[PDB]
């Protein structure tokens, strides 16, 4: 090696590499972009989905109707000829949500009495979070013990009676329903997340502040997934009464931004929610990407003239800071969504600030528009709504209109011409220059913020497609029969609206992206029209061509190994010839048959081509291949049993002997002519004790059911002796369900598909990823959950005569449970349901214990609720405590 000629070169290369890596790390840490994944909104008018919001923006209407009437407001003495009279408002209209009164308490675990004390804000936030999680494709139950920060912007307000006076039914829950801290704690508790939970209140800029904090937390790497939004729903007209005192409200209640007829900013209400993640992680996991956030800035006006009046210097400084943080020049923004409050004094100041920030150096005319013209001021719900509108219109490539802007304000200069009002829709086609936009939000406290939004990278293009022949099952779940029917009807309607879909795509979308709720229905489709008929039948309420079953807390399955019976064995076609797992699970066992039979995969086909000494090895091969296929498809047994010839297969699947070595060692003579239950001894045995010396059905199955497994998978080409198993199951304990793998005369893969459908309907856990290892199917948007809402609102002894005694005890227990939980309809509560999902806590637990003790005059342990989570268990325990 040449001294001082080559040695230094390697060191220089290493140093350059390290410097490049360090600078890349600095750049990534400082300003990594964040991507927007999901979308959720609840806006005035008929808006319930972002698509409806985009439709409203496109047609250009307004959602100002008038004051509501469900909240029980006086609505009469709210106005008077004298505006100075106490308790008098000024606004005679505005956009108000009509769904704040209704709620679904049963879907989550919450007692109705507790639900009656819940603020509408956190009431809506749960639904928004669930919808935004479902839309992104991530199943809600998947996110457990994972870092997922939550940030919500709210305003305290007031809902019910004062704490000091108290109530009658709601006494111990007035806190947790009427505070701002729990607004994110409730979501975290329901979803089981572990990321930070923060509630922030900064007047009208709360949503923007929350999204800025979420972006910072994502950038620092503290949390891998973020969730931000805002909400503002008022139940009392006191806010309008107060805001009428300084006369800052327009009479009609319409916002006219930058117009000549400014009178006020009105009022409205709404909510919004976003899901965020850094671009690299989103790309790695293949999550959908809609747009990219780059930079934000937060600032306060400081010592402004008075308290309410804003300042222009702070706005200019924050705009410049936001532009410089993301490294985007002032001449690289096509449109700006202004505050657009429509007040008399704010508009000239905002216009001058915008001219200073952008219009001073402009080549192309900037497009200006305000969303508050269509909806009115939404308090904390603003800001995020502007971002939603910007991303929607920028995805659609069309700039929406602005109402009541035909008369520009005279106090604002327009001679420069660098700023153009959006009086008409403007096309926004994609081009070489990436599209960008900016939003702003100024509150009454003084804090103001700004942000920059950019279009998604054009890398999604390049998708390939490929046809196929295997039909994938269709599944859907709900929380109640009515929910199931509504979900089926909605799916059918949506499919009717959008034709030309791919069955594989829909099956893939429905397989992953929905929770495993305890009301299941599944089937296998053949046509886009026949599936419509099946869905219509499901919506009507009759199960035809589909498997329907209800099962909760039942997820383990058990294989059963019978003897002979499917001697037709005509399914030698396909499977090992088509199914990759069945193909790979047949030869190695067949290779074990070579020692004394020379009986490989091909001679099985040639033997059939259309003596127990040769049926037994092929029976064992079929058993092991089917077991391998099932275990590869995600379902694994909790136990296994065998017939006279099934013990060999049981040992093979238990690990007693090797995969192929088990074959020709138990069958060394070759004709003789997992925790599992030893059928010969009727007890569980280890795989080790099985040897050469080793070589009551009702009792075995009843013991297995007592152990805690309530289903069996019958692995065979034909169902055999299943009726006896069902009869024994009915005669002891709960119902015992069994499903055959295949039926004689039907060797098609559709039989396996419907078998999988029945297994899913039986509550058996299925790994859908193995089913969709690869087919050429991608995600397709689908409708969300059809909640079932109802109106909630506050305003400011025998001596063992017979088992009939047992039913009496059960009925009185049911009545007491209905009474304590606040269920007004004291007619029915779920029987198999436990108590943790009914919303009963310690406060109600001790009251129920005292009621039961007083009713029957017995002493009952405090922790009995833990001992007997079910009403049936408690009834059985108490009926055995007699005498």
């Amino acid at each position, epitope marked *: *090696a*040449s001294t*001082d000629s*080559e040695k230094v070169a*390697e*060191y220089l290369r*290493r140093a350059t590499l*390290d410097l490049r890596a360090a600078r890349q790390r600095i750049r990534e840490l400082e300003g990594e972009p964040v991507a927007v994944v999901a979308m959720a909104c609840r806006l005035p008018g008929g808006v319930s989905t972002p698509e409806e919001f985009w439709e409203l923006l496109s047609e250009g209407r307004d959602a100002v109707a008038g004051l509501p009437t469900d909240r029980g407001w006086d609505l009469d003495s709210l106005f008077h000829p004298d505006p100075t009279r106490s308790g008098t408002a000024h606004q005679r209209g505005g956009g108000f949500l009509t769904e704040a009164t209704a709620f679904d308490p049963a879907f989550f675990g919450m007692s109705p009495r507790e639900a009656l004390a819940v603020d509408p804000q956190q009431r809506l936030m749960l639904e928004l979070s669930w919808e935004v999680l479902e839309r992104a494709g991530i199943p809600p139950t998947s996110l457990q013990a994972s870092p997922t920060g939550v940030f919500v912007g709210l305003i305290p307000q007031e809902y019910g009676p004062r704490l000091a006076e108290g109530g009658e039914g709601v006494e111990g829950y007035l806190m947790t329903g009427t505070t701002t801290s729990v607004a994110s704690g409730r979501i975290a508790y329901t979803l089981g997340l572990e990321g930070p939970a923060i509630s922030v209140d900064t007047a009208c800029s709360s949503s923007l502040v929350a999204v800025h904090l979420a972006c910072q937390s994502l950038r620092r790497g503290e949390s891998s997934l973020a969730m931000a939004g805002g909400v503002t729903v008022m139940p009392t007209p006191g806010m309008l009464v107060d805001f009428s005192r300084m006369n800052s409200l327009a009479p009609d209640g319409r916002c006219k931004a930058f117009s000549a007829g400014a009178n006020g900013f009105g009022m409205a209400e709404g909510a919004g929610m976003l899901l965020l993640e850094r671009l690299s992680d989103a790309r790695r996991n293949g999550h959908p990407v809609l747009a990219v956030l780059r930079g934000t800035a937060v600032n306060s006006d400081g010592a402004s003239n008075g308290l309410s009046a804003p300042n222009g210097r702070a706005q200019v400084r924050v705009i410049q800071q936001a532009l410089a943080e993301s490294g985007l020049g002032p001449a690289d923004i096509d449109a700006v969504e202004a505050h657009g409050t429509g007040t008399r004094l704010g508009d000239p100041i905002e216009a001058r600030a915008l001219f200073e920030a952008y219009g001073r150096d402009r080549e192309q005319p900037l497009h200006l528009g305000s969303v508050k013209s269509n909806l009115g001021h939404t308090q904390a719900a603003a800001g995020v709504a502007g971002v939603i509108k910007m991303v929607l219109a920028m995805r659609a490539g069309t700039l929406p209109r602005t109402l009541h802007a035909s008369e520009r304000s005279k106090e604002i200069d327009w001679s420069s011409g660098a700023i153009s009002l959006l009086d008409e829709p403007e096309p926004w086609p994609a081009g070489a220059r990436p599209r960008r936009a900016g939003v702003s939000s100024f509150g009454i406290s003084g804090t103001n913020a700004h942000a920059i939004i950019e279009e998604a990278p054009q890398v999604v293009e390049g998708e390939r497609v490929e046809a196929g022949d295997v039909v994938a099952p269709w599944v859907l779940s709900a929380s109640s029969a009515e929910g199931l029917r509504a979900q089926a009807a909605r799916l059918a309607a949506h499919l009717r609206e959008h034709p030309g879909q791919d069955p594989r795509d829909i099956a893939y979308s429905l397989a992953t992206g929905r929770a495993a709720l305890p009301h299941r229905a599944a089937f296998a489709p053949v046509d886009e029209s026949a599936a419509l008929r099946v869905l219509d039948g499901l919506a009507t309420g009759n199960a035809d061509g589909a498997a329907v079953g209800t099962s909760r807390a039942q997820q383990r399955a058990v294989f059963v190994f019978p003897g002979q019976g499917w001697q037709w064995a005509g399914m030698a076609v396909d499977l090992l010839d088509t199914s990759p797992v069945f193909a790979a699970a047949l030869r190695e066992c067949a290779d074990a048959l070579e020692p004394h039979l020379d009986f490989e995969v091909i001679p099985f086909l040639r033997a059939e081509a259309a003596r127990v000494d040769v049926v037994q090895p092929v029976m064992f091969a079929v058993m092991v291949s089917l077991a391998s296929m099932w275990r590869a498809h995600g379902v694994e047994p909790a136990a296994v049993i065998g017939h006279s010839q099934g013990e060999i297969a049981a040992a093979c699947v238990a690990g007693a002997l090797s995969l192929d070595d088990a074959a020709r060692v138990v069958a060394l003579r070759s004709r003789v002519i997992v925790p599992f239950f030893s059928t010969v001894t009727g007890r569980w045995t280890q795989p080790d004790e099985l040897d050469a010396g080793y070589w009551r059905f009702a009792d075995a199955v009843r013991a297995l059911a007592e152990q805690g497994y309530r289903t069996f998978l019958e692995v065979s080409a034909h169902p055999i002796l299943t009726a006896a198993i069902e009869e024994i199951g009915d005669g002891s304990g709960a119902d015992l369900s069994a499903i055959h793998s295949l039926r004689r005369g039907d060797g098609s893969l559709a039989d396996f598909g419907e078998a999988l459908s029945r297994a899913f309907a039986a509550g058996v856990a299925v790994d859908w990823e193995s089913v969709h290892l690869g087919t050429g199917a991608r995600r397709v948007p689908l409708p969300t959950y059809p909640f079932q809402r109802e109106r909630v609102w506050l305003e400011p002894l025998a001596s063992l005569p017979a088992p009939e005694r047992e039913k009496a005890l059960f009925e009185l227990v049911r009545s007491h449970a209905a009474a304590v939980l606040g269920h007004a309809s004291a007619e029915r509560v779920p029987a198999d349901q436990a108590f943790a999902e009914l919303g009963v806590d310690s406060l109600s637990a001790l009251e129920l214990r005292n009621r039961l003790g007083a009713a029957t005059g017995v002493r009952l342990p405090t922790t009995t609720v833990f001992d007997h989570p079910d009403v049936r268990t408690l009834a059985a325990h108490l009926t055995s405590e007699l005498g």
Partner: antibody
Amino acid sequence: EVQLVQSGGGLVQPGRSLRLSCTASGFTFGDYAMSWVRQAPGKGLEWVGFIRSKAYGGTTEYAASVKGRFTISRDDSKSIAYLQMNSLKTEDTAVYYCTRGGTLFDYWGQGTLVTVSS
Amino acid sequence: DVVMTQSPLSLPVTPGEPASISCRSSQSLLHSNGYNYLDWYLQKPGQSPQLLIYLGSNRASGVPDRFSGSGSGTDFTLKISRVEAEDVGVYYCMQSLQTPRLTFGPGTKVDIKR
């Protein structure tokens, strides 16, 4: 990223012949210089050979107990290094490594057993 | 041209507190350019060797910040901060004045104190 893999290895009787393939990807292979090291099964690490780069041209030098025993080979079309085996000896039974750099031993390979017996 | 670690060959360690490995050399290196041609290597049990620090103390990327070299041209010593799990194996002192290097050296073992 930069990956190095090695292939070629098994049981060979004394006096046989063999070759070893080192595969590089993720960087401009031309500049760097390859080097082969060998660790005895239960001893330290001893350097074997080092091939220079075509920028300086040059060749290897090997060392004692290996000079005149077997040679190296290096390509440029697919960046595959070759170590030849000639008249293998039982004492040569040891794991072999291929690594980047001639003096500063940077990112290494994965190793190969390569046993010799009869 | 002859360098031996001279550090405790066993050097039992226990997590929490830090440690150090001395590396005494022959006549100092001090190349005219103003550097010391000494490197460090670490071998995990049953793993491929990896580089830790090249000339002086400028530990390369990927290496955790808990490692830090130091020393003059004839009294090199490697400092390790708070000790954690693993890091048990063989550490090697490597010179660069003589190109035809034959053997890395006996090295110093690392194991948990008991």
